[PDB]
Structure 1
Amino acid sequence: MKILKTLTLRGPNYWSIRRKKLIVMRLDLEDLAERPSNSIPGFYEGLIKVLPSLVEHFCSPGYQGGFLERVKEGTYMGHIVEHVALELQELVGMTAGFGRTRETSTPGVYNVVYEYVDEQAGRYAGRAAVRLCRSLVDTGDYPRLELEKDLEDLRDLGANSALGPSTETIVTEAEARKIPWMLLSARAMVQLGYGVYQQRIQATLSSHSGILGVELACDKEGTKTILQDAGIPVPRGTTIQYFDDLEEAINDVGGYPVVIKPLDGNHGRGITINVRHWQEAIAAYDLAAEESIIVERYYEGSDHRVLVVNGKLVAVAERIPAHVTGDGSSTISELIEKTNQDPNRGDGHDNILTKIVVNKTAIDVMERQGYNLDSVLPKDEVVYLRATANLSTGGIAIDRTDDIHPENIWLMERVAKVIGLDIAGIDVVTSDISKPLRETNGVIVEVNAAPGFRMHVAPSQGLPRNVAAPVLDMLFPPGTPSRIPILAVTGTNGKTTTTRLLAHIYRQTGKTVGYTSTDAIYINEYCVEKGDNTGPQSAGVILRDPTVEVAVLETARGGILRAGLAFDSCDVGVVLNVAADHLGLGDIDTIEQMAKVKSVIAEVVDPSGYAVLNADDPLVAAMADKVKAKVAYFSMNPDNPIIQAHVRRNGIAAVYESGYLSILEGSWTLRVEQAKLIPMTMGGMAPFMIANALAACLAAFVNGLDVEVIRQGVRTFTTSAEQTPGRMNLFNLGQHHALVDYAHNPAGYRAVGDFVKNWQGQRFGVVGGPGDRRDSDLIELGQIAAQVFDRIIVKEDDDKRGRSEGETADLIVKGILQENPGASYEVILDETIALNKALDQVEEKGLVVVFPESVTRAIDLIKVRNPIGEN
């Protein structure tokens, strides 16, 4: 079983709208495609003994064991590779169950689709499923060590990409509130929202956290100075630069019960909390001396943490260090084993509490209390195993949020404002949080910028608090948006033209409009990038841009099939047409399948938004029954039963009638403008340009723009040569006209042919046609020039020559001859220049139509003829 191709999808796609995270593997069953399990002896018992959990897999039979009801009656490794990749991920906690198998290409090649949690773990499991499954169709078993090491790699891959818990807390709440989020390429930052409404976070710091506040909070001498100048209670203490003066320093402080700290800040090191004797001060001195805040008075009370978010109190918790108590006449080592078995204790963050560990530091703490491991404690005596509180070291946290006195609430909020920090943790020492600090002689010990949350969202006693909700409320204040409007345009033909017009109309309101097309990425007429910029990678440039207010995005099938959509949902989804282009590529062979790709846009429109459908297109109009959004329609014929049924129920439609482009809103008609006065349409002679204009006008209307704005936009929009090269470039050359286009699929040859039919001048001829990459549709294309043109010349012996020589010129003329034999010059005249000069074969005011292998040549060979200007 060979893997030929792997795709990773991230967003709504062809296989599923909701299952955004999928891996699509193209697997070549060189063997096994001819052996449906019953031809592979032992491949039932072997597969289940290796992976005994594969009973929880259901297939067509909706039963437990439904997978195993088969397997022995095989599926030609469909289902088996799929279910193994899903089970290998499930075995390590990557929780995923969606999957599908479909045969493609030649017999034996399958598309295996499965759900992932982590991108690399997902791809790893796929490859591992193939190795496991292949060994079992060769031999009857799979080594245990070849399963255990793969599970170990999946566990590491799923750990390395994890977000820290403070980021997970904020992100989870953001999803509940429908705020989009993205990871950024630098410094572990996360973006929340789109365009001009974006915010950034990093753990517990945000775009609202100022630098002066954060730096002051990290300066202990600075913080103390600022707070005592504001009338806020702080500990009394001094500065002794390792002079042997501690014995005197205690006199200014007030006596022996003092705290000795390293002068610098190097975590919880070299600190003695309660010095009772002279020699203890010296031992502390010798440790303090290791670094380059000393002799504070020791205040007697508990350690409380207060969380303040936007100048307002959110949560309060009491912290207690790891300890044991005199729970009967047992020793300390016995008490530790008795309580360390509590089911709420375990490693990391997989439990509420963690385990108690005895080490040299626990012993040092116990010795100061007069106890050791073999000591028996008196009933109800408490012995501490740690100097400071921390949940990660085995301590506890008790919620005291509703027990805090109103005056203490006022003081805490004032402290955060004085030091200038939005999200702050305040460390308070007091015997009673329910009484004023001035009555209990309490103090504020520390102010911490960017505090953690485990102790407030997962306390060991009391009720959990939703800490994230107050954070998102300051970042995205009540009734304020996190998104900018998105207008997504798709369909086989006309996307680029529709996209540029729609962006032009929005621009008349004075907003910053960003858009992407197959030519470039633009913001307010400045070019950001050039080249084919369709697809999810370009959409992300516009959505991450801090200045963009409106996004207009042309969407191609290549992007959807290769990686999914970049935006999840949108306000307006426009589907222009479905036609038989790109068939056979991307595993899509039929028109019915192509319609399922285009319908992805219609199905991601938000219920409060609109889908804009073409009522003159039977595959597109039919999408209306899948759409959860409102539906608007456009057409080139007012007498369209769909339109009539729709406006009779007070829907909205755009139609072309009486020479005008107008909007039907229930019983009322709004005329926007005349087709002949809108420059993109060649004097009303290009029906396909009229249809593109109707779609843009209707999208602008249903999304709230006024009619006058729409009129201004259509009247000033241009598609001149060198703005839209290769797309209807009609040149004026004395008493003669020439047209350069670049029809791709057959619909564009017909669209140009109708322009030709409507022309009121002299005879027409064509000097071009399709190349080597066309799959014998060349005869049909030759048949379009027939009965459209008076003079039809084959030029199709170009330089590209992907296959053979000028075979398409021969196939094209067969088509020309079958439908319009006798057409002037049904011969091959040249490869290039001697034919696209054949303006000299046309009488006064006639026209030369060019369907070149390359637009640049097509237009430069007109410039050399000394043209006057645009038609």
Structure 2
Amino acid sequence: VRINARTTDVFDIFNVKQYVGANPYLNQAALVFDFAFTESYQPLPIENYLAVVGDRYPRLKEIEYQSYAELFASTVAEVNKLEMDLHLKGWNVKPIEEINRIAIESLHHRTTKEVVYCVWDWFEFITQGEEFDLSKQIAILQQLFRNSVYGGPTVYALLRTANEKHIPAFYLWDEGLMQYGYGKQQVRGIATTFDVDSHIDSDFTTQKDDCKKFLQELGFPVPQGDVLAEAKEVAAEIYPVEAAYDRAVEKICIIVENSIAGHDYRLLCVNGRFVAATERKPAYVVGDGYSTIAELIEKENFSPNRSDTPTSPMGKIRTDEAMHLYLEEQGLDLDSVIDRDRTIYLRKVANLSSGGFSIDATNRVHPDNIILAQDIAQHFRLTCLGIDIITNDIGRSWKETSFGIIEINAAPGVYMHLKPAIGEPVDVTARILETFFETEKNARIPIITFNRVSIRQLQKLSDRILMSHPDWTIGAVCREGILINRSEKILNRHYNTNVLNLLRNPKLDLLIAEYDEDALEAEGMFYHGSNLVVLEDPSEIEMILTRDVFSDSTVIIKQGREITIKRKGLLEQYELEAEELIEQVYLKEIGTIS
């Protein structure tokens, strides 16, 4: 329970439910609850509540709130974003009997439940006690959300791009993947890996030395070393760069005869093209106050190193000084001081975890390097490739400058190119999604929704459709059977998983489904939209199926003897000539040929 709830609290909330997909109350997935008064004590007037809730967010004062339920719903909706500008914005309230049923849009249900509990607790402290610390709870909520299946920078970026592009997407348990389509036009993957990536190329990319040999035999700039007895520049001697070496002593890669440089760059290729590049810069510490120690560094840690906020330039600076030796090579105490003499660098290897940062370098690369990267890319069957280079200057050609290729990676993280410390953002997920899909039209399949139907009618309809397209695959599901074309399969006890199984099939061309009142009230739906709707003696609930249609859609309703047909918002009504079945009405209205 609310551990703290005790003694008194004017309000009360009960009956939490989770709805996936379209539901009677809201268009999207939602969490539903019921609000009421205890009536033992009189709550404070709305004047006090408003100003207090009108502070933390000025957007609340924009619209009138009327009763308490709307105020509570708007407060929950605004807090749900977790101050990260998530695309979740939806709430609704309906007064039923003396109670008020409220539904709010959700993606992770547990997070929204916790948000509701926290807002209720905040509300209840506005009278008795009069204190609260929301900032301590918001951090916990943000971490909980980020530790979820839907929580991830790349994952959420792809989710947001899909929502903007209007592309369906849902999570597949058991396997543990994410799907972005219906039927034949589908793609499954986790993070940046996809199901169209070869099994052989990925294994080859991790061999290190063999990739070096392969790249060298095509005439590419790579280090010339070979991979202790003699073996220490016996005849490994070119531009040499023993006790010290042995005490200093990856797999025996002896190596670097040809050249070396300072600056490290990363290039990203998508679908055999060049998009985005990044320079990695290590941590440095300077300013006049004298002994930086952990000081100018925990002052540097003051204006935006706000490691805590999940939206910040860069995190904080931590040590595990193993490069103390490194600095010791430069010669200074951990603890002594200097003034305006240089920049000093805490870590030699730029680790974006501990203080290293990223700089955009996209619009200042020589076209020759672009051509070289594109040529390297188009030799593997992957979709995203990452190349690591070491250069003295990226602005000129590689033939007249020192250059090198060190590493090639198959599953690159693309967070750096989205949230750079210095520079302008570059969108990489848009390219990834445009690789597979072009519009929203070619990501969906025709869907037919019924209200009540039997097996024989389904077989008749499927045969009628197959008389036109003989090579299609058609899936049909109802309350007592499931069919592919004309054959019968096994039915699962949980009704909603059958639609999932039909949508996972990689050969489906058309879907036929039936939703009654009990199923619709238990769990809302699984898909969004329809191309043809048929109602026979609809009830009050079983008409919300008309809210989700497109501009080009057909709706047929039969109420008693009366029949109504709506095509593109054109209404034609008739009455039954005699005792006739409804099948004759829609058997001639098959116009999904397009």
If the length of structure 1 is used for normalisation, what is the TM-score? 0.59
Aligned to 2:343: 382
**What secondary structure, in the 3-state scheme, does the structure 1 residue paired with 2:377 have?**
helix
Give the letter for the 2:157 counterpart.
Answer: T
- C-alpha distance in 2, partners of 1:547/1:451? 31
Aligned to 1:764: none
- C-alpha distance in 2, partners of 1:347/1:202? 27
- Residue 428 (structure 1) aligned with residue 389 (structure 2): yes
Aligned to 2:147: 160
- C-alpha distance in 1, partners of 2:486/2:245? 72
- C-alpha distance in 1, partners of 2:563/2:13? 36
Tell me, yes or no, if the aligned pair for 1:429 and 1:444 is still in contact at 8 Å: yes
Distance verdict in 2 for CA 1:116–1:218, change over 3 Å = same
Tell me, yes or no, if the aligned pair for 2:223 and 2:255 is still in contact at 8 Å: no
Aligned to 2:504: 544
**What secondary structure, in the 3-state scheme, does the structure 2 residue paired with 1:233 have?**
coil
- C-alpha distance in 2, partners of 1:403/1:89? 41
1:214 Cα deviation from its structure 2 partner: 0.8
- Residue 200 (structure 1) aligned with residue 196 (structure 2): no
Instruction: Please tell me the root mean square deviation across aligned C-alpha atoms, in Å.
Output: 4.0
- Residue 221 (structure 1) aligned with residue 187 (structure 2): no
**What secondary structure, in the 3-state scheme, does the structure 2 residue paired with 1:566 have?**
coil
1:451 Cα deviation from its structure 2 partner: 0.4
1:233 Cα deviation from its structure 2 partner: 1.7
**What secondary structure, in the 3-state scheme, does the structure 1 residue paired with 2:348 have?**
coil
Tell me, yes or no, if the aligned pair for 1:398 and 1:461 is still in contact at 8 Å: yes
- How does 1:585-624 map onto structure 2 within 5 Å? 594=540, 597-607=541-551, 609-614=552-557, 621=564
Aligned to 2:6: none
- Residue 248 (structure 1) aligned with residue 241 (structure 2): no
Aligned to 1:10: 20
Tell me, yes or no, if the aligned pair for 2:25 and 2:92 is still in contact at 8 Å: no
Distance verdict in 2 for CA 1:322–1:245, change over 3 Å = farther
- C-alpha distance in 1, partners of 2:593/2:575? 23
**What secondary structure, in the 3-state scheme, does the structure 2 residue paired with 1:606 have?**
coil
Tell me, yes or no, if the aligned pair for 1:346 and 1:355 is still in contact at 8 Å: yes
Aligned to 2:518: 558
1:237 Cα deviation from its structure 2 partner: 1.8
- Residue 448 (structure 1) aligned with residue 409 (structure 2): yes
**What secondary structure, in the 3-state scheme, does the structure 2 residue paired with 1:382 have?**
coil
- C-alpha distance in 2, partners of 1:619/1:331? 89
The partner residue of 1:281 within 239, 245, 249 is 245
- Residue 568 (structure 1) aligned with residue 558 (structure 2): no
Aligned to 2:106: 116
- C-alpha distance in 2, partners of 1:697/1:532? 34
Give the letter for the 1:10 counterpart.
Answer: V
- Residue 44 (structure 1) aligned with residue 32 (structure 2): no
Aligned to 1:23: 31
**Which structure's CA Rg is the greater one?**
1
Tell me, yes or no, if the aligned pair for 2:111 and 2:144 is still in contact at 8 Å: yes
1:118 Cα deviation from its structure 2 partner: 2.2
The superposition leaves residues 588-623 of structure 1 with CA deviations (integer Å, 9 ceiling, x where unpaired) of xxxxxx0xx33322221122x2132237669985x9
The percentage of counterpart residues that share the same residue type is 24
Give the letter for the 1:233 counterpart.
Answer: P
1:512 Cα deviation from its structure 2 partner: 0.3
Counting matched residue pairs gives: 577
1:253 Cα deviation from its structure 2 partner: 4.5
Tell me, yes or no, if the aligned pair for 2:26 and 2:103 is still in contact at 8 Å: no
Tell me, yes or no, if the aligned pair for 1:22 and 1:115 is still in contact at 8 Å: yes
Tell me, yes or no, if the aligned pair for 2:18 and 2:32 is still in contact at 8 Å: yes
- C-alpha distance in 2, partners of 1:149/1:353? 22
The partner residue of 2:218 within 225, 230, 234 is 230
1:169 Cα deviation from its structure 2 partner: 2.3
The partner residue of 2:169 within 172, 177, 181 is 181
Aligned to 1:53: 53
Aligned to 1:457: 418
- C-alpha distance in 2, partners of 1:517/1:414? 53
Tell me, yes or no, if the aligned pair for 2:449 and 2:534 is still in contact at 8 Å: yes
- C-alpha distance in 1, partners of 2:111/2:172? 21
**What secondary structure, in the 3-state scheme, does the structure 1 residue paired with 2:445 have?**
coil
- Residue 172 (structure 1) aligned with residue 173 (structure 2): no
Q: Higher helix share goes to which structure?
A: 1
Distance verdict in 2 for CA 1:136–1:470, change over 3 Å = closer
The superposition leaves residues 315-357 of structure 1 with CA deviations (integer Å, 9 ceiling, x where unpaired) of 11121111235x5585544653554434266347421222223
Aligned to 1:708: none
- C-alpha distance in 2, partners of 1:252/1:347? 49
- C-alpha distance in 2, partners of 1:4/1:173? 35
**What secondary structure, in the 3-state scheme, does the structure 2 residue paired with 1:111 have?**
strand
- C-alpha distance in 1, partners of 2:448/2:305? 51
- C-alpha distance in 2, partners of 1:421/1:532? 40
**What secondary structure, in the 3-state scheme, does the structure 1 residue paired with 2:417 have?**
helix
1:172 Cα deviation from its structure 2 partner: 2.1
1:536 Cα deviation from its structure 2 partner: 4.2
Tell me, yes or no, if the aligned pair for 2:74 and 2:91 is still in contact at 8 Å: no
1:301 Cα deviation from its structure 2 partner: 3.6
Tell me, yes or no, if the aligned pair for 1:365 and 1:384 is still in contact at 8 Å: no
Aligned to 2:8: none
**What secondary structure, in the 3-state scheme, does the structure 1 residue paired with 2:425 have?**
coil
Give the letter for the 2:466 counterpart.
Answer: R
1:198 Cα deviation from its structure 2 partner: 0.5
- Which gives a bigger RCO, structure 1 or 2 (Cα 8 Å, sep 6+)? 2
- How does 1:45-124 map onto structure 2 within 5 Å? 52-53=52-53, 89=80, 98-104=91-97, 110-124=100-114
- C-alpha distance in 2, partners of 1:65/1:480? 37
Structure 1 gaps of 5+ residues are: 72-77, 258-277, 580-593, 638-655, 657-684, 706-871
**What secondary structure, in the 3-state scheme, does the structure 2 residue paired with 1:601 have?**
helix
1:494 Cα deviation from its structure 2 partner: 5.0
Distance verdict in 2 for CA 1:559–1:371, change over 3 Å = same
Aligned to 1:695: 586
- C-alpha distance in 2, partners of 1:153/1:527? 50
Tell me, yes or no, if the aligned pair for 1:502 and 1:552 is still in contact at 8 Å: no
The partner residue of 2:274 within 294, 301, 313 is 313
1:431 Cα deviation from its structure 2 partner: 1.1
Tell me, yes or no, if the aligned pair for 1:518 and 1:532 is still in contact at 8 Å: no
Tell me, yes or no, if the aligned pair for 1:82 and 1:101 is still in contact at 8 Å: no
